[PDB]
Structures are given as C-alpha cells and as structure tokens.
C-alpha cells in the first residue's frame, strides 16, 4: 500500500484520516474546531501542538495533527 | 434537446421525493431483507446483474446451506470473496438487507443501506443517501 | 476553446521549419461524424502550396472527370468546391501528389497526405507521419473578457440583498437548487449554510465576513438568511401567525 | 508590504508586482469549489487546489470532464471560495476530486482515463509482431536478442533508434511484482523490494506497470478501456483512494505523453 | 543585448546512486529546451566502460544451457549487463571469471587486469551444482551511451563468442518534467524536475557535471562564432 | 409491499441496463422505499382519519394497536409523496403553496425541521453529513500527552 | 570505442538572410535534441530590435483613419509590425518617416538615427494622394521574443504616443535534418544540418552564435 509521496491538500492521506475519527462527516467538524482553535490561538487557545510550517494555514496544521493521534474527540 | 430538462424535472421530483432520507442511526437490527437470485441453479454460474444487485451490501440472514456449515454471517458487506465463497458452498439464493425492508423510524440505518460506494466502506452515521 | 498558447518554437514543425498554427484532437472527428475539417485541411495543403499535375501524354485516370483549367496552380491559389459537387475522395488523393513549392526543393506532405511532423518540445520526429494542411477556421464570439466573472465583495441590490448578477455590473454567479442537491448529496452542511446565509443573503453576515477574513478571525457563525426573514415577514403579512421555539425555552424574530 | 488594509485593498486592486508572491502563500491548500451547469449528480461540484495560471481561463482536470459531463467547447464552470474552516473541511475530505473518485452510481471509478489517454496508453501497451528489439530466441549462432538487463536499458535502447515501444521483449524486473501464477512458480517465500525475476511482455507494459502501485501485481494486457476500468476498480476495492487518485494520474500523464506518439491521426 | 536572472540548481538524493536535480526558475521555455538535451546528453554522451561480447566454456552452438549451473546463459547475460566496470584504456581489454564447485559466483570473484575496476563487488551473477566449473571470458571496452549485440565479423565469425548489448551510459535511467512556477508576476517560467539513476561507478552531480560539460564544450563551437549578443547569470 | 418493492427496481433497472449504464439497487430502493411509506385507510377511523386518505405506516402502526381502524397498502406518484409531508414548508415550497398554508395555519402544526429542504429555506444547518447534533457538537481537546511538553 | 574527435560546426550559405550549417560528428539520435535546442533558443530567445510604439501627428488613436491614405493606421501599424530594423544602443530611439503629396510611402522613405538600420527598403506601408500628408515617428527598443503591447496609461506616456505589438525577433525560420551517416557496424554517428533563415536583422552566422552562447551562458554547473 505505497503512494510515494501526498502533495498539497492531498497530504496527509484520507484513509489514514478515517482510521482516526468515526467517519469523514465526524472527521470535518474534528479538523475545522481545531482548526478554528489554532486560528483563535494567534488571536480557547491550545496549540499548535506539531511543529507547523513558515507559512501554513490552520486547516493543514489541524489535518497533520489528527494524523499523529494528538488529540481526542467526543460524539454528541 | 427535450431530453436534458425532463431528466432535470424527473431528477427534481426524485429529490424531492427522497429529500428527507439520511442515514439516522447505524443498526435498528431487523431480520427482514430481500433475496438476490445470485446463480440460479448451477452450475450442473455468475449472474450478469450481480454488481447492481447483491454487491456492497450488508446480509439479513447468517449464510446457512444443506449441512449448516454458515460460511458467513449476518452484516458483511459482500465483496467478490463473499459472492465466490457462496457460489463455492452452493446456495441459489441470498437475503440481503435493504432500505425497502429497514424498522428505522426516521430515515434510515447505516447497516440497512449497506457499503457506500463514494467511500466504499459501510455507509457513514449521516449520509444524505 | 484555446486550451495553451503554444510559444512557436515548442509547437510541432514541418520539416522545412513552418511550425504549425492549430492542433486539433483525432478523437474529435470519427464519433462527433465529420471529416469535412480532414478533407478541408488536405484541399487546404493542396490550395497553400502551389501544384501541377504531371499531365502525362494524355492526362492520368484519376482525374477523368477533372475540371480543365485546374491541373496547374500558383502559391495562396484559393479554391472554390461546390458544396454537393466539389472535390472528391479519388480528386484529392491525385492532387496531394502536388509540387514542393517551399522555397527549398524537397515535399513537405506525402500522397496520403501525411506530413513527417518535428516535435519542438522534445526534439524527435513523431514516429509515425501526422495529418498536416490548411483548415480556414473562425473565432467566435464567445470570448473570455465577457464570460470571465470575479466577486470578493462588492456592491449588493437594494431590493433583494445578495449580490446582482452579471458580468458588467460587477456580479456574482448563480448558486442553484440543483447545486445545493450536490452539496447536501456530499453533507457539506456548513458549505451551504454558508453559501446560503453570508455568502448571500445575511447583511450582518456578508460585512463581518470581509472584516473577519481580512483580520484574519474565525468566520463567524451564519445567523438567518434575509431570504428567510423575508417570508417570515410575508407569512407576519398574511396573517399566519409563524413563532420560532426550541424544546425549552421560546425565540424571538 | 502593505502600511494599513486600504493600502493592501490599493495595492491588489492596481495588480502590483508583489501580490504575486502573496497569492500563491495565501492560496497554499484553500480550496476552491468548481461547478458545471447543469449540476445534474453530486460530481458535479467538486473541491480542488488552485495553481495560478496567466491568462483568463480555468485549466480543469481531464479526468473531472465525466465528473462535470463537461466538453471544452465553450462550456463554462462556477468556481466557489469555501470560507469557514468547516467549509474548507468537507471541501478538502468529502468533495476534494481525488477523495472521491468512485461515482455514487455503481461505486465505479469516474475519474477514470477516457478519450486520448485510453488510446495512448492503448498504444503504449498494445504488443505488435514484427517490431524493432523483438525477443527472437536465436538458434546456433546468435543468443535470443530481445532480452534487457533493466526496464533503464530497454528505456535507453527505445531513446536510441534499436527498440519499440510494443515489442515482446524479454526484461528482468525488480520494482514491479509478476502476476499471479508468476508470484508462486519464482519466490513463494520472500517478497520483491529489491530482488530481480524475468518478464516476457512490451517495454510500454513495463513503463505502465511502473506507473501503477509497488504492492500491485503485473498485468501483461493491452489496456483497453474495460481493462482500465477492472484494473482501477481492483486499485479502488484492494488499495486507498489516494493510491488510486495518483496512480490514474500517472496513467493520465504517460497516457497523454504516448497519445502523441500513438499515431493516432 | 539580454539579461536573464537566477537560473538557480539544487539537487535532491533519493537512493545513493538516485537523485533528483531542479533547476528553476527558467524563462517560460528554456525548461525543455535544455531538458532533454540534458537527458540525451546524460544517457548517450558521458564516457563509461561495459561488457561488450562474452564467451563461455562448452556452449559452441547451444541455446542457453551451461553445464554445472541452475541459471540460463540468457539470465547470464542479463546478469553479466548489469556488472559495472571502469577503464582506463579506450580499447577493449579482455577479464576472465572462473569458479569451481557448488554455491554461487560473485562480482568479486573476477580477477581485473590493470587499469579495470569493479565498484561493487557483492553482485550476483550464477548458481553454480555440484561437479561443475564455470570459466566465462567477458570482453570490457570504454564508450558512450548504449550500444546493441555488434555482429562486425567478431560474434558472426568466432565459434564460442556471444556479443551482448553494451551499457556504456554510468546513467541508467534519466528521465525529466516541467512545472509552471510565478518568478515576479507572469507564470509559465519553467521548473526542470531531471530524475537521474546512475550506477555506483559516477555519482549524479559528477555526471551532471560530466554532461553540462560535454554540452558548454560542444555549444562552445557555436558560442566562438561571434560572441556579441549574450545573456546573463 | 415486498414483490412490487422488487418490481419497480426490475422494471426500472432494466431500462438503464438496456441503456448502457450501470446504477446500484439500494438507490433505486431508497425511491421505491419513499413510494410505499403511506396506507390507504377503508373504514373505522378511530382517532379522525378519514376513509381513502395517505396515513404515514410508523404513526398509524402506532394507532391501530388501539389498546382500549383498517387500512390497505397503497403505492403513491413521487410527486403525490412529495406534497404528503409533516413539514409545511416543504409542502408549501413542492407546490400549492395557499392550499397546504390553509389547511396548516387551521392545525396549528409545529414544523420539527426533521426534513432538510425546510432547514435549507430557514437557512439551518442542514440534519445530514456535517449537521447532525452528533457531529456539529463534538468536543475536540488536544491529549494531555501531547499538551504536557507542547 | 569512442569516436575520439570534438564535433565541427561549419557554416554553409544558401542565401545572405538564410544559412545552412552542418555539425558532426555526434552520438546515434544525439542530433535531433541538440537541433532542437539551437532552434527553441533562436526562435525564443535572440536579441533583435522592433518597434515598440508608433505615434502619428494627426491621428490621436489606433482605431481611426489619416486623411489621404488608402490603408488605415489599424493596418499602417500591422504593416510597420511587418518592418525588419537593428540598432546598436538598446534604449529607446524615436525613428521619423515623414512624407507629403501623393505617391507609396515604403520602408525604404524612413530616416533612422545614427546606429539604427531598415533591412528592408521595397516593403509597401501605404499608398498617398495629393490631399494626404504622412508624418509618423517610430520608436524602436532592443529586446529578445515578443512582448504584448505595453499600455501608455502605465507608464508616463502621453495620449499620442500609440502602443505597437512588437516582435524582438531577428529569426524568421530554423529547421534541421539529421544525416544516418555509416551502418549500424563500425560505430554509427549523427551528422546534424540546421536552416536557420533571418529577417535580414542580423545574419544566420550572428543568430546561432548568439543561441549558442545563450544555451553555454544557459548550461551551469
Ligand atoms: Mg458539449
Ligand atoms: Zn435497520
């Protein structure tokens, strides 16, 4: 199961995002209140938690970390 | 030229229909389903339509045959495997679980549905499906 | 429509080094059913450069019932084919055996009418030999600079408060019903909710949006459409009296 | 590079040359949702990363032309700026065109090769009698001829004028893993990252095979529509989605690049 | 005349012999212009030294059957196409490779006369069974790029010789694409992405350096002509 | 129920099978599902229902226990199933928008907004994919392990 | 066995404004790329001269008439796209083609500065009548390949000052054949002969040097 290398929004790999949360539909609003949390944080404010880039975005950060298994999320 | 707009009507109503029908909840748990023909006597067979019919779906019935050696159980999404191995063990009939047969109150079961083909996993716990 | 603007070196080349002015796709002539471009491309390779049909010592076969006063032509020698009853398949095939008028004493085409084309992005020759000629083809009206659109934010009708369409009056584009089926069909619920709400109709949500992603905040969360309040107020007007309520506890409009 | 907003609002209204560095910082993974009237099934919106092109035209995809039923014959698309972080979410996972390829229909690959890369990786795999660098396996006098240390060799024998492309050439492969009967009769022990076995099939097969998945078996075919069709579905059902939205855009990129030198005229 | 600026290289190992080199960002064209002259000039130009004709003990008109091994005299070949070398002659010297009894035979094995050597000798070439002795004589020369089975009244002519498809190139596979990448404002200034697998002998920067040399030395002749009207760096 | 349920998808499968195109039954399945979802009522009644009427099966499967009615199956036109809804918005939205806000405004009905098509028209998030109470309101916290060193 | 000998780049003549030139010996299917480059470089990239900007005393815009003339100043600007001019200094020089009463003012009437030239005095531009009186000033600028034509409104330009597609290309065609030369037996070699045919700006000789430096100044490691 080898794919060389993900580029741009296609990194990190969705299959390896679903094993994370639920489903995708959970995953979404698991990524986008993190992602709204590191957009607060510059301005809730924990984070980011990886190493991010020079110039990266939230939503990157956010996708990267649920990869890594850094955080935890409860079902409503 | 005619064909576009009727198709346009036609997939209007069908949405209209079916527009409050989500995946709800994931297992109500009913025995009820339908049976796919899949190889109807033979071979002494793969049946054309299988694809449309039996694969990506969850079974109503554990796979029971003349000794009772239930290859399979109840709710496995038939992939070819799944179909081979039913061919294999020699049953001429399957009972697979469907949203015409599903006792979900509001919309539908994730399980009664079965695999989601834009995933191509079992059906996720809100599909507008 | 024009997919790239080649830079005339890395476009392929004929021999002689005239490169090419279009390409066309193959695959957009045997299912689409008209060959008249092939055929129009060929006569046109035959009308481009000069021709003369080495008559013989009295005239060849092929071109039996040929026209008189047509066997030799000059270079730009523009041709005339009656619609029902111009140049044939037997016609063209004899008249692609045509001169080498290219300033240099060599063909460019072949009698199939197959020229061995030079890739300019590579280098190599093309390994097998490429239906090359002269197509008269037109630009249409449908240009770029008018079916190009582009909206941020800027000026909202009085009337009704999202964005007034057009290109000239600086508008956003439709986002329809059959749109909306797709996105709920994916459940990208607050796609639509947004699409829906500040992205069009909410007037507390289309100017904090703008302050929002300019200072670079979280987006804030899209309240009610002016669409909606709009046919609570209608439905206020018509006498049926509409109140909004959650489980516990009563909203207010 | 801005004071103040308005200078910034100024200065990206008067297009000055330092927007440009900016625009693709700020574009950096910001999808964008990309519509074709009429919007009949839910391909018909689709998210994407937006590379910046000069000119004033949107530069589509060709396998998301079936996911919109859209010619380039004068057919516009409505691009979309998701703006929420949610938004951007079930942009970037639900609707992202790579995510998903399978169509909500059969749950068969849409974003598939059709048109020219069908016929170019047809071309490019298809094998042909009478070729240049054929196996002849000589009697005698000479060895068999048609036989090539590494895919590199072969590849360096095609660039020189000795090899085509569609010749039933004998190659000793090492990245690649043989089909299925093939898998039993050599190794049936240890697996193949950086061990050799010996294949008898087209240079263009190999150059294909070298495109699909490491783990994916071979396919010695030519690779008819269907054949795509089954192989991809194989990639769709066995391997991840990403496995699959790569894969058939190398198919995409070597399809397209041997449509050319296909001679399909 | 012309003023071109930043036509900056960085390279990118994959694998020891592997490597990737970007030059960027080039004037919208420049990218293929020198891109598959690189390519071409990297596999067929750069000087390098390979098997060109073997000859082994029995097989005077055999098919690919050798006495004493498991292997065929066809996978023999395609081993022995792989066995990397460098000379220091420009004609072709002769090495000989003999083993006896079981197991297998190594690239170390060999016995390289003066000038030749073999950069990795754990290779594998033949298994040989038990009660046998391999004796095979491979003729090394030096050339560029690659070079097919030569029937020049050498393998034709001689009994117990077989000529063998010579892979001069120390590169294997090259091959390169292009991107779009904005500079100042316009895009379409091209990126070069060469991907380079050389074999151990060269590393790909001296390769590089190898082709960029023999391509500056031959546009040199062009270059002398004038020398007027010129670019930048 | 069951052998028209199987019919409707034969008959309706076939026309793209001959077609062509390939479509998975449970689609179909999901429309032939939202056609027989409604009961034809003959006599008794019992709670005000009235005779040749379209009852919803849940609710009346829920009346006809009568623990201190007769009703047929019936197969209804997805337009007819359309306009039989709960919600007064969508009934209003679909078609004879007077009509259905008339006989509504008289029952005094209080739309849940379990449909979607009403939560689109209201401007709510919509109770499908990314709107559901069980998604929308996740709680997200980073791990106190990946916190500690942060 | 190498081919021990650097390749010879003799230069041919067919014509003063197109030349052949023959380079060999050369590795087998090493040719056609090597062409192609020397093509791709003089196509794109020479330093040649043009015009940039035409401005006619009369006239205030493109898109209107001269009195007197036949041609439109739309077709006079297409035509002077069609001139053929070198200039030594690469800033901006300003040429003058001025010309009274009837007659065919052709490109050979213009009067350049010192160190600019017309190679091409037999063009027709357009044709006069005693009533007509053509003055227009043509500015010239050294560049390389094509740029779209720069808009006065950007730059400190006044309104009668109009803008002209120019072309910096003193290439007009490059082509090249690549002799098999020798069988496959004793080592074969590729000997390359290319066309490259001027506008008569510089000659064939100058252009491909120029590429060639260009490609050397180009090829860094
Ligand atoms: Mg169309
Ligand atoms: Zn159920």
């Known amino acids: 199961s080898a794919y060389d290398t993900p580029l741009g929004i296609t990194n990190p790999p969705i299959d390896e995002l679903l094993s994370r949360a639920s489903s995708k539909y959970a995953l979404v609003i698991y990524a986008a209140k993190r992602a709204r949390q590191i957009n607060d944080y510059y301005n809730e404010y924990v984070g980011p938690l990886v190493e991010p880039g020079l110039q990266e975005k939230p939503l990157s950060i956010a996708l990267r970390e649920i990869h890594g298994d850094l955080l935890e999320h409860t079902e409503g | ?129 | 429509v024009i997919g790239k603007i080649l830079p005339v070196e890395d476009m392929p080349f004929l021999p002689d080094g005239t490169p090419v002015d279009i390409i066309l796709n193959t695959h957009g002539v045997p299912r689409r059913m008209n060959i008249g471009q092939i055929l129009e491309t060929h006569l046109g390779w035959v009308a481009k450069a000069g021709w003369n049909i080495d008559v013989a010592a009295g005239v060849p076969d092929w071109a039996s019932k040929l026209p008189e006063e047509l066997y030799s032509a000059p270079a730009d020698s523009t041709v005339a084919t009656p619609v029902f009853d111009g140049a044939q398949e037997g016609e063209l095939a004899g008249l692609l055996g045509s001169t080498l008028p290219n300033r240099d004493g060599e063909v460019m085409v072949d009698a199939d009418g197959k020229s061995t084309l030079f890739d300019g992005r590579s280098g190599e020759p093309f390994p097998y030999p490429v239906t090359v000629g002269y197509m008269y083809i037109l630009k249409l009206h449908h240009l770029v600079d008018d079916k190009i659109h582009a909206r941020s934010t800027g000026p909202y009708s009085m009337i009704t408060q999202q964005p007034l369409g057009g290109k000239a009056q600086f508008g956003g584009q439709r986002f329809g019903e059959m749109e909306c089926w797709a996105m709920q069909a994916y459940g990208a619920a607050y796609t639509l909710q947004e699409l829906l709400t500040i992205k069009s109709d909410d007037t507390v949500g289309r100017v904090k949006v703008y302050e929002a992603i300019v200072k670079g905040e979280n987006i804030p969360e899209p309240g009610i459409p002016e669409s909606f309040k709009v046919l609570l107020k209608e439905l206020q007007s018509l006498c049926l009296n509409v109140e909004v309520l959650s489980s516990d506890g009563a909203a207010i409009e | 590079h801005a004071q103040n907003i308005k200078s910034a609002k100024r200065m990206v209204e008067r297009q000055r040359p330092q927007v440009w560095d900016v625009l693709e910082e700020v574009i950096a993974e910001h999808p964008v949702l990309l519509n074709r009237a009429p919007t009949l099934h839910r391909l018909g919106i689709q998210a994407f990363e937006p590379q910046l092109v000069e000119g004033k035209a949107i530069q589509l995809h060709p396998l998301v032309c079936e996911a919109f039923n859209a010619d380039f014959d004068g057919d516009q698309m409505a691009v979309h700026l998701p703006l929420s972080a949610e938004a951007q979410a079930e942009a970037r996972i639900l609707m992202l065109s790579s995510n998903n390829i399978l169509s909500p229909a059969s749950g068969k690959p849409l974003a598939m090769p059709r048109l020219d890369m069908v016929t170019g990786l047809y071309y490019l795999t298809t094998l042909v009698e009478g070729a240049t660098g054929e196996y002849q396996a000589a009697t005698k006098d000479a060895p068999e001829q048609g036989v090539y240390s590494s895919p590199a060799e072969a590849i360096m024998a095609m660039d020189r004028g000795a090899l085509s492309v569609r010749a039933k050439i004998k190659v000793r492969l090492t990245e690649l893993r043989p089909p299925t009967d093939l898998e039993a009769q050599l190794f049936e022990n240890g697996w193949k990252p950086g061990d050799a076995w010996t294949a008898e099939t087209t240079l263009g097969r190999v150059m294909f095979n070298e495109l699909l998945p490491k783990s994916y078996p071979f396919v010695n075919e030519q690779m008819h529509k269907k054949v795509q069709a089954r192989i991809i579905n194989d990639l769709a059902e066995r391997f991840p989605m990403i496995v699959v939205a790569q894969t058939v855009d190398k198919l995409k990129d070597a399809g397209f690049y041997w449509a050319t030198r296909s001679g399909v005229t | 005349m012309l003023i071109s600026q930043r036509p900056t290289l960085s390279e990118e190992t994959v694998a020891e012999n592997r490597s990737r080199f970007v030059i960027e960002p080039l004037e919208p064209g420049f990218g293929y212009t020198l891109g598959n002259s690189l390519r071409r000039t990297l596999l067929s130009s750069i000087p390098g030294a390979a098997v060109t004709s073997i000859r082994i003990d029995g097989v005077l008109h055999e098919f690919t059957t050798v006495p004493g091994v498991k292997e065929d005299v066809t996978d023999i070949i395609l081993n022995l196409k792989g066995l990397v070398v460098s000379s220091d002659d420009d004609e072709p010297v002769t090495m000989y490779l003999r083993k006896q009894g079981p197991g297998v035979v190594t690239a170390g094995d060999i016995v390289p006369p003066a000038g030749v050597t073999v950069h990795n000798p754990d290779m594998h070439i033949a298994t040989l069974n038990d009660k046998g002795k391999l004796e095979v004589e491979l003729v090394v020369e030096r050339g560029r790029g690659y070079v097919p089975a030569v029937q020049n009244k050498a393998s034709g002519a001689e009994i117990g010789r077989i000529p063998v498809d010579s892979i001069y190139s120390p590169v294997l596979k090259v091959t390169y694409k292009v991107e779009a990448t904005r500079v100042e404002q316009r895009t379409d200034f091209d990126k070069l992405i060469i991907d380079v697998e050389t074999k151990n002998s060269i590393s790909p920067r001296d390769a590089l350096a190898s082709a960029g040399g023999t391509l500056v030395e031959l546009f040199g002749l062009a270059r002398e002509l004038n020398a007027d009207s010129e670019h930048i760096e | 129920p069951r052998e028209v349920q199987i019919h409707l998808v034969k008959e309706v499968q076939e026309v793209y099978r001959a077609q062509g195109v390939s479509i998975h039954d449970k689609h179909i399945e999901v429309i032939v599902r939202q056609m027989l979802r409604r009961v034809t009522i003959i006599d008794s009644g019992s709670t005000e229902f009235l005779p040749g009427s379209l009852t919803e099966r849940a609710e009346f499967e829920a009346e006809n226990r009568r623990v201190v009615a007769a009703g047929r199956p019936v197969l209804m036109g997805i337009t007819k199933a359309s306009l039989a809804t709960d919600s007064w918005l969508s009934a209003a939205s679909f078609q004879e928008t007077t009509r259905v806000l008339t006989d509504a405004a008289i029952n005094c009905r209080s739309d849940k907004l379990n449909g979607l098509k009403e939560n689109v028209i209201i401007g709510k998030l919509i109770p499908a994919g990314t709107g559901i109470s069980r998604y929308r309101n996740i709680q997200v916290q980073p791990t106190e392990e990946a916190r500690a060193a942060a």
């Not at chain 2, 209007?12 to 899949?38: A, K």
């Open chain 2, 1 to 129: 030229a005619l064909r576009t707009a009727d198709s346009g009507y036609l997939t209007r109503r069908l949405v209209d229909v079916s527009q409050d029908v989500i995946v709800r909840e994931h297992d109500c748990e009913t025995e009820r389903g339908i049976n796919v023909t899949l190889a109807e006597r033979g071979p002494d067979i793969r049946d054309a339509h299988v694809e449309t019919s039996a694969f990506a779906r969850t079974l109503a019935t554990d796979a029971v045959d003349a000794n009772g050696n239930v290859i399979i159980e109840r709710g496995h999404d038939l992939g070819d495997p799944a179909i081979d191995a039913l061919l294999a063990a020699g049953i001429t009939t399957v009972k697979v679980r469907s949203v015409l047969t599903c006792t979900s109150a509001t919309g539908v079961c994730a399980m009664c549905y079965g695999r989601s083909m834009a995933t191509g996993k079992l059906v996720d716990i809100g599909e507008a499906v």
